[PDB]
From TrEMBL, chain C:
The keyword Chaperone does not apply. Zn(2+) 1 binds at C32. This is Fiber. The keyword Chloroplast does not apply. Keywords: Calcium, Capsid protein, Host nucleus, Host-virus interaction, Late protein, Metal-binding, Viral attachment to host adhesion receptor, Viral attachment to host cell, Virion, Virus entry into host cell, Zinc. Zn(2+) 2 binds at H50, E170. Transmembrane segments: none annotated. GO terms for cellular component: host cell nucleus; viral capsid. Zn(2+) 4 binds at K55, E167. It comes from Human adenovirus D37. Mg(2+) 1 binds at D20. Zn(2+) 5 binds at D77. Zn(2+) 3 binds at H50, E170, E172.
Length: 183, 187, 184
């Protein structure tokens, strides 16, 4: 009941450009009013598997969205597949889909949905991770809370890079952040 | 009833609660969550008025940093000469605070052995945490947030946030992305 | 369960990088369920890595501090960190019994496998930057890797490196926070 996650195996669970082209490893642990989060990404096939910006100069970013309903349940338009996201049990998931995880959602007062009122940057956390664990291959991970439509809550990960990478496999080191919880 | 003693915070609203250069010119959103012997901290800043609201280093090249101080007495109570106001610094209840001002929060204070006050002893850097946040959420607008534990005088404990930047920003509003860190608690 | 495993927070050397007890690694691990919240800093007090001068010694650019653990999460004697004051917290010191089990504080083996024939993924690494002497123009990279050492069941390795040409700069750092997925 304290951790929502993807399991930490290498089985693809995520669709960026094509079905199951990636394994998003995400762990959300509820430390009361904050969620401690840990994330990494392995792209296993398709467009973002091997970066070559000589061949493809404008392939410089992509986005992974987790959309949740009023119950904190994952919506199927999410890039992360529903079968792969649940409370922890051992090194696996519970075999039954969870019904409520409002306690893990980003707080809507802290991180309001888009509206006509002033939009503040505090709903974003920036980090840098490294491709293949190499220190000279940074990519930015921008995490944004509750800015997607078609949901009550959202966490989006945008991965972008400014270097011209040539035949670099897109699999990442791990980043930790936190966010304020809905309840 | 539903009072959260594991979290000291400013609330997550955008109501100004902080004085940098003039009364209530900013909202400091600061959440301290006690994970036992460590405090998990989440911080952002919105400046809404005065000198640090709109930065222009073409107009004012000297305006490059400012500091926000939280000073605490022996019981972990926020002193009135802090930049943050006492009115809405308290234990969490829902998205608001508990009804009455807290009297004890020693378990949220930074550890005085890890982070000693100034003295004759050698001063170590481990009482500082550096992070970079981004103005307006734009990746080409970094500013440095330097957090320092227990280096202020006239208090038992302190947490100070220094914000600075080295770029020459032109009409860049000072409102930041969020940054998470932790520190060792006093108990 | 919600406990803290740490080095104590004094500045007494507890670590051997190049010579005996030449450093104080201050490391605090706090179990928040399936994740360990980690907080780390380093003070080198003596020896090869105390005062860096890359004008006279341009090739002195990195060093490594290893914590090796057995199947019960007990620190092994050949780790750079000494066993004497690595233990569960009591006040500003430690419990009086050296711990027997801390498997719940160990890096998860499925998330971070031990070296093998299989593909080594980068997710067993965390990168951060700390600053020498608290000076904003003195960065150094702290690279933390999980479960990549041999002769143990679990490991946490800190590699400290820098790319600036430091001239007589004392290696003592600001603090860095990270987390990792817990075995249990
Ligand atoms: C694991 C790891 O850290 N890897 C890094 C590696 C690694 O260190 C080496 O590979 C190991 O050998 O290095 C990477 O970068 C090296 C690339 C080579 N390179 C070339 C240059 C030339 N510069 C011009 C220049 C700049 N400098 C010195 C800069 C001074 O910086 C410091 C300092 O004083 O030393 C760094 C400190 O960390 C700062 N302190 C603190 C507390 O933060 C300090 C203080 O701020 C000041 O001292 C106070 O005055 O400053 N020497 N020569 C070219 C150059 C241009 N720029 C600016 C544009 C690029 O940067 C930004 C931006 O827009 O401003 C920075 C933003 O943070 C970033 N945004 C995000 C969201 O991340 C943004 C975006 O990436 C882009 O806008 C695109 O969206 O870019 N800087 N330098 N210098 N270095 C490597 O690639 O190998 C980086 C790895 O991360
Ligand atoms: Zn491949
Ligand atoms: Zn404004
Ligand atoms: Zn020294």
């Amino acid at each position: 009941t304290r951790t929502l996650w993807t399991t930490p195996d290498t089985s693809p669970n995520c669709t960026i450009a094509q079905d199951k082209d990636s394994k998003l490893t995400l762990v959300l642990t509820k430390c009361g009013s904050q969620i401690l989060a840990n994330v990494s990404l392995i792209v296993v096939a398709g467009k973002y598997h091997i970066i070559n910006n000589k061949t493809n100069p404008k392939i410089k970013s992509f986005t992974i969205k987790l959309l949740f309903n009023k119950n904190g349940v994952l919506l199927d338009n999410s890039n992360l597949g529903k079968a792969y996201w649940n409370f922890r049990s051992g090194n696996s998931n519970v075999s039954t889909a969870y019904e409520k995880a409002i306690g893990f959602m980003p707080n809507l007062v802290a991180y309001p949905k888009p509206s006509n009122s002033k939009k503040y940057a505090r709903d974003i956390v920036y980090g840098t991770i490294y491709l293949g664990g190499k220190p000279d291959q940074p990519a930015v991970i921008k995490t944004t809370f509750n800015q997607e439509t078609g949901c009550e809550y959202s966490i989006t990960f945008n991965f972008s890079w400014s270097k011209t990478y040539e035949n670099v496999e897109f699999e990442t080191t791990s980043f930790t952040f936190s966010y304020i919880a809905q309840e």
